[PDB]
Design an enzyme around this catalytic site. Structure first.
Site, mmCIF file in Angstrom:
data_model
loop_
_atom_site.group_PDB
_atom_site.id
_atom_site.type_symbol
_atom_site.label_atom_id
_atom_site.label_comp_id
_atom_site.label_asym_id
_atom_site.label_seq_id
_atom_site.Cartn_x
_atom_site.Cartn_y
_atom_site.Cartn_z
ATOM 1 N N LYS A 179 0.791 -1.220 0.000
ATOM 2 C CA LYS A 179 0.000 0.000 0.000
ATOM 3 C C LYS A 179 0.830 1.280 0.000
ATOM 4 O O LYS A 179 0.344 2.338 -0.412
ATOM 5 C CB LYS A 179 -0.969 0.017 1.183
ATOM 6 N N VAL A 192 -1.219 1.715 -5.398
ATOM 7 C CA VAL A 192 -1.706 0.565 -4.644
ATOM 8 C C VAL A 192 -2.543 1.089 -3.486
ATOM 9 O O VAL A 192 -2.043 1.809 -2.619
ATOM 10 C CB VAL A 192 -0.546 -0.288 -4.073
ATOM 11 N N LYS A 200 -6.244 -7.627 -1.535
ATOM 12 C CA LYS A 200 -6.122 -8.767 -2.427
ATOM 13 C C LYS A 200 -4.754 -9.428 -2.261
ATOM 14 O O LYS A 200 -4.643 -10.652 -2.268
ATOM 15 C CB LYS A 200 -6.351 -8.332 -3.881
ATOM 16 N N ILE A 231 -11.750 -6.927 -32.475
ATOM 17 C CA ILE A 231 -12.813 -7.326 -31.568
ATOM 18 C C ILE A 231 -12.546 -6.693 -30.207
ATOM 19 O O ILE A 231 -11.573 -7.030 -29.526
ATOM 20 C CB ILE A 231 -12.894 -8.863 -31.379
ATOM 21 N N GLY A 261 6.568 -5.282 -30.966
ATOM 22 C CA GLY A 261 5.247 -5.864 -31.113
ATOM 23 C C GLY A 261 4.654 -5.528 -32.469
ATOM 24 O O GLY A 261 3.737 -6.200 -32.944
ATOM 25 N N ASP A 262 5.191 -4.484 -33.092
ATOM 26 C CA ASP A 262 4.742 -4.031 -34.400
ATOM 27 C C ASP A 262 5.703 -2.965 -34.929
ATOM 28 O O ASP A 262 6.713 -2.658 -34.292
ATOM 29 C CB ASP A 262 3.328 -3.441 -34.310
ATOM 30 N N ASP A 296 5.958 0.971 -36.216
ATOM 31 C CA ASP A 296 5.318 2.273 -36.254
ATOM 32 C C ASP A 296 6.157 3.236 -37.090
ATOM 33 O O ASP A 296 7.261 3.612 -36.699
ATOM 34 C CB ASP A 296 5.146 2.784 -34.821
HETATM 35 NA NA NA Z 1 -9.160 -6.907 -29.749
HETATM 36 NA NA NA Z 2 -0.697 3.595 -2.105
#
Ligand code: NA
Ligand code: NA
Ligand code: NA
Ligand code: NA
Length: 327
Positions: free
Chosen positions: A55, A60, A67, A101, A184-185, A187
């Site tokens: 925290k 956070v 969690k 999508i 990743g690609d 540009d």
């Molecule tokens: Na997508």
């Molecule tokens: Na924090």
DNA sequence: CCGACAGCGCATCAGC
DNA sequence: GCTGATGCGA
DNA sequence: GTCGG
């Protein structure tokens, strides 16, 4: 960078939650909150012992600290365990990996019984052009591009662009420009002296030539200033063909070009820290221009920029090599 | 307590 | 036919 | 979900 082993269990947990917020619950801001928490924890150089410890990190809060406590004590999260097993939710979440999508199309598909790539293949007519291409190259699109291939890809783009008109200026940005080992690609930012903020086929002629030499294989979208498509390096003798890759090409006016290269070169972290340092010095920097923030706050007209350095100068910052822009 | 969390090109939808 | 809104991407 | 006016 801290080893994944330190808090990878935690970062993985936060990233999965992120995806579900984005793709299923359609809560983009929660999606980013999780990503932000995952990122700050990913760079924490200590094995987290509790939620309270976590925290203290920016991004956070109470819920995530809570969690973390559950995951440290049980090795899992009940809510996450449950959503993973949910047929509807896991299917919606999965379908979004198809380029084109989004959360909406994914939800609509799953609502009518289409949940897997196989279902998508049997329902081509229910997919728009973009989606069919994302489906066609689903695997290829998730693969990364080794730098060597990126260099080969660059060779072609730079050669073809100059062939069309030697006056064009083309710069491959993204992490590749910062020296990344993989991408990743691709540009690509494109400009031409004949195109300024105050000056219709400049982009088209380039895309066309790239298709003419069979480099560009498909088109997702194409307008007067932006092109988003697919490309593929030529296969070698008896060699396995290279996977198809995502490539974007933007046409930017000359007087806004370098503000564009800077921005699209990033990294994002660097962009923030640079936008910050920029403001304290009395300047605002976006992808288009750099403008002087006035006494009351009236941002005067955009300043002239003829290179990346020009921008650095306006903010009293030593030009930073793309190599050193990780932050 | 509650608003910000980026802005925008292109494809396609919703609606006149 | 058109304009504006929405979905999507990076 | 987290931050902060
Ligand atoms: Na997508
Ligand atoms: Na924090
Ligand atoms: Na996706
Ligand atoms: Na020439």
């Amino acid at each position: 960078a801290p080893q994944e082993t330190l808090n990878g269990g935690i970062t993985d947990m936060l990233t999965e939650l992120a995806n579900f917020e984005k793709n299923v619950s359609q809560a983009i801001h929660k999606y980013n909150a999780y990503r932000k928490a995952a990122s700050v924890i990913a760079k924490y150089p200590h094995k987290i012992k509790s939620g309270a410890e976590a925290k203290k990190l920016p991004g956070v809060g109470t819920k995530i600290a809570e969690k973390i406590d559950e995951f440290l004590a049980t090795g899992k999260l009940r809510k996450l365990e449950k959503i993973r097993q949910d047929d509807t939710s896991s299917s919606i979440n999965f379908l979004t990996r198809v380029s084109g999508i989004g959360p909406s199309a994914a939800r609509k598909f799953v609502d009518e019984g289409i949940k897997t790539l196989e279902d998508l293949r049997k329902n081509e007519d229910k997919l728009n052009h973009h989606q069919r291409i994302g489906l066609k190259y689903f695997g290829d699109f998730e693969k990364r591009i080794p730098r060597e291939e990126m260099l080969q890809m660059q060779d072609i783009v730079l050669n073809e662009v100059k062939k069309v008109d030697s006056e064009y200026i083309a710069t491959v940005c993204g992490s590749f420009r910062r020296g990344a080992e993989s991408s990743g690609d691709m540009d690509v930012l494109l400009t031409h002296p004949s195109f300024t903020s105050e000056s219709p086929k400049l982009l088209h002629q380039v895309v066309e030539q790239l298709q003419k030499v069979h480099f560009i294989t498909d088109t997702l979208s194409k307008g007067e200033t932006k092109f988003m498509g697919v490309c593929q390096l030529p296969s070698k003798n008896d060699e396995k063909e290279y996977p198809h890759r995502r490539i974007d090409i933007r046409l930017i006016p000359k007087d806004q070009y370098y503000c564009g290269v800077l921005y699209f070169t990033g990294s994002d972290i660097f962009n923030k820290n640079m936008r910050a340092h920029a403001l304290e010095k009395g300047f605002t920097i976006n992808e288009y221009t750099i403008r002087p923030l006035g006494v009351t706050g009236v941002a005067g007209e955009p300043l002239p920029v003829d290179s990346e350095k020009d921008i650095f100068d306006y903010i009293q910052w030593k030009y930073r090599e793309p190599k050193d822009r990780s932050e």
